[PDB]
């Protein structure tokens, strides 16, 4: 047995080049640069192996930020079937680009586009969801308006609800909406055709989520309904969850748990499979207006003006976020940030990693306050590059940090 062995030289020597490339593909950028300078054969392996191309592709595959820039900047055109050195020179430009995006977030530097929804009578946009093509928005005038993400023009008005459209979600096939008229409606996302109406709740349907054959709805009538969707036209009630003592303002779920929150000041956790009560999250001093749940993290916003972070398994509150001056009315988070909107029209950006580290002081947690709405902020969604928010002031704002 030899004491030492040049793996990266020996393997290609033996006609096993791909193994050597695979070893090097695990390196971070700085270690791949180091490998380049080890010796001539190491350099040749990295160059002939297109390792910088392979490294950028691994990032695009594993990081939506890298994925987003590849699409938004156009260098993604060269990826997934221009020599290796092109990718080597591109990599630092991407790093600096991320840094400038992160700086814009930290410093609140952005451009702003403003859609005036021009509601004739009852003003305000209660809910919204967006992709790269469109913004689908729900309005206090009883309609759903679909906006083109690029031209900001109105492409479709969906009528049928007899009251405000309070909540909505869509996927590649359908739009599903809940309304002050106590109904849930299902619309064709392409044509707008009404496909189904669910008559179940006795009071306004305040929130819903659905994905992969199931839907959860919740209502001012203090109940949660769990639905099985075999198709847009075959939707069956599986179970009704009761136990909340006031309107259920929001519901979220995944394969582990259903999570509901209420005017009764509590968050409740239910087993998605069994619909059995699991546990109550106590702690907010007032009713809860908004919530998001993913993985182990629950994020809630309340009439007590605070935000609370919770781990779903033990129910512990991990952090209380203070700073909003009015009711926290909508909230979202991703892997880096929390974004919340309040009754005073203000939006706050929070550092989620910092917030989940109990060493960090509270005053360092709010990165920026963004003030461009003139009424209550009802809904927002965001990603690495932008925020889309909507308000009682009858506008939708896109805040763009790129």
């Amino acid at each position: 047995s030899m004491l030492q062995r040049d793996f990266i030289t020996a393997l290609p020597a033996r006609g096993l080049d791909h193994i050597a490339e695979n070893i090097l593909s695990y390196l971070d950028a700085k270690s791949l640069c180091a490998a380049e300078l080890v010796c001539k054969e190491w350099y040749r392996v990295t160059s002939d192996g297109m390792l910088w191309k392979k490294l950028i592709e691994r990032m695009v595959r594993t990081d939506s930020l890298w994925r987003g820039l590849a699409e938004r900047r156009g260098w993604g055109q060269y990826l997934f079937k221009p020599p290796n050195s092109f990718y080597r020179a591109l990599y630092p430009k991407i790093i600096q680009d991320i840094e400038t995006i992160e700086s814009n977030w930290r410093c609140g530097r952005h451009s702003l586009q403003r859609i005036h929804c021009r509601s004739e009578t009852s003003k305000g946009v209660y809910c919204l969801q967006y992709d790269d093509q469109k913004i689908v928005s729900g309005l206090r005038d009883n309609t759903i308006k679909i906006w083109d993400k690029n031209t900001l023009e109105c492409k479709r008005i969906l009528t049928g609800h007899t009251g405000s459209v309070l909540c909505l979600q869509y996927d590649e096939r359908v739009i599903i909406t809940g309304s002050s008229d106590s109904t849930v409606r299902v619309w064709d996302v392409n044509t707008g055709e009404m496909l189904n109406t669910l008559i179940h709740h006795c009071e306004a349907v305040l929130h819903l989520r659905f994905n992969n054959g199931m839907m959860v709805t919740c209502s001012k009538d203090r109940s949660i309904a769990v639905w099985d969707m075999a198709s847009p036209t075959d939707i069956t009630l599986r179970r009704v969850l009761v136990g909340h003592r006031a309107a259920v303002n929001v519901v979220d779920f995944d394969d582990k748990y259903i999570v509901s929150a209420s005017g009764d000041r509590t968050i409740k956790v239910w087993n998605t499979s069994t619909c059995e009560f699991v546990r109550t999250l106590n702690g907010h001093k007032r009713g809860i207006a908004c919530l998001q749940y993913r993985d182990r993290l629950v994020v809630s916003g309340s009439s007590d003006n605070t935000i609370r972070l919770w781990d779903i398994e033990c129910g512990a509150c991990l952090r209380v976020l203070e700073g909003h001056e009015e009711l926290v009315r909508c909230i979202r988070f991703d892997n880096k940030r929390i974004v919340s909107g309040a009754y005073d029209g203000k939006i706050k950006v929070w550092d989620l990693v910092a917030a989940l580290d109990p060493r960090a002081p509270a005053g360092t947690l709010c990165l920026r306050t963004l003030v461009e709405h003139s009424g209550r902020v009802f809904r927002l969604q965001f990603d690495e590059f932008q925020i889309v928010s909507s308000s009682h002031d009858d506008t939708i704002l896109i805040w763009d940090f790129l």
């Binding site: 305000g124 809910c127 405000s164 001012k220 006031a246 005017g263 009713g287 009439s303």
Partner: peptide
Amino acid sequence: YLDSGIHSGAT
């Protein structure tokens, strides 16, 4: 007053 989207424990 509150928006139609949310409600408290009142009755």
